[PDB]
Design a protein around this ligand. Sequence first.
Ligand SMILES: *[C@@H]1O[C@H](CO)[C@@H](O)[C@H](O)[C@H]1NC(C)=O
Ligand SMILES: [Cu+2]
Length: 227
Amino acid sequence: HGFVQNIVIDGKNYGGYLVNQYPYMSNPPEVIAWSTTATDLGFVDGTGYQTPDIICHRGAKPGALTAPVSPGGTVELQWTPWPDSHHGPVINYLAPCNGDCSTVDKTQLEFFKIAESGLINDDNPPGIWASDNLIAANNSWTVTIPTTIAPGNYVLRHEIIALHSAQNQDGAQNYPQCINLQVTGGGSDNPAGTLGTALYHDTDPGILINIYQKLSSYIIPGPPLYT
Ligand SMILES: *[C@@H]1O[C@H](CO)[C@@H](O)[C@H](O)[C@H]1NC(C)=O
Ligand SMILES: [Cu+2]
């Protein structure tokens, strides 16, 4: 359980969607982060993979604001303290807004994977995962925006998948957090995109899995990494 509290881009903080404050306020502030109704600081499980909730979390609506990123620049997402128990991958996707991200129809967004990290070491099951790298970095993740993509406005869909309960059907816990970016530079790729509701299926090999046994491999879920 947790959420993205802050985003650091080009030397400033863009406050996140503080899901334990703003839903209680009813004139809440404009941010680059999508609003959600996930006030339990919880997840979307396999029962919601083909519902709109998987796209940018439960009841999500676009952020009003968009943050510019320098070409090949970094976006640092700062989480609330991630529990060690919640082992799993950290995955990052972009989807083009083709206009102002604040007015997009999330159900039409087509995402391409720009980064993925999974099982890092398995010397002591359940092992060390991307989520453990995030904890070791004091609960932050650095995303590098590719220089090869067409610039414009994009949703960044940043996600941890916790696998501590994933040996049961619908046990994997997805924690997507979306932010609005203005990608800048000289690139031209328009990578093939995947609807939010086709990223994951509740029987995928990196989703329905017992992490407590020795693992020979881990197949990071979602569509193929763009390079
Ligand atoms: C996180 O930062 C705090 C100090 O702000 C430190 O006490 C803690 O050990 C840090 N680093 C790691 C690797 O967790
Ligand atoms: Cu949790």
